Amino acid sequence: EQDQQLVERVQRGDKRAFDLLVLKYQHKILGLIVRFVHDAQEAQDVAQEAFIKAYRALGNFRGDSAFYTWLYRIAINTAKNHLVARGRRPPKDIESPERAMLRDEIEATVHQTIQQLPEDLRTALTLREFEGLSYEDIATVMQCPVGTVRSRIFRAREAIDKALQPLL
């Protein structure tokens, strides 16, 4: 359960937390819808309906599995149903050339800022992102307080965000 704190709020019915999961997973859900509808707009309108449907069936989510695995199949279901709604028997992100350049530059700016980070920002931020360690477990590894771990990652994420703000 990668989104535990934010899942707890939506299972409690929090729509602002749901706004965060849609904001967080909109690309993956769309990159899935696109596989089925082959229209840029039409997929977004389904992706809407799939998230709208996703909220409405949060009662039927038991926390049995990861929220995204659960949510992903609701998105899958919506799209094939969209095909099944029309006579079509049901069986990646494709952008405007201007957006494929922007995405590349964003990708370039992300990796470049990481490359230029102070080591502690880089080690702490990665230990979270790639080693999957808790702030607790990181504090032990980097021989630092738990409050420092929370700060270093924030600053590391802040450095990347400041580099990307003009791009977005």
Partner: protein, 71 residues
Amino acid sequence: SREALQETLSAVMDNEADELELRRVLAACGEDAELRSTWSRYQLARSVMHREPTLPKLDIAAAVSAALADE
């Protein structure tokens, strides 16, 4: 408090936020457009570190939030 809320956003990303700030940021996200945009960007960059699909300047969330707003 945007900067403090931005640090809170970072902890929520890692599920290390305290229960009180968790309540606080979700309310601030509702009424500070830049704060939600910060979350959007944070997860946008997070997908790059993990090489996941990204489509910059995509905001399906707003149309969903609006559609879920009432009821």
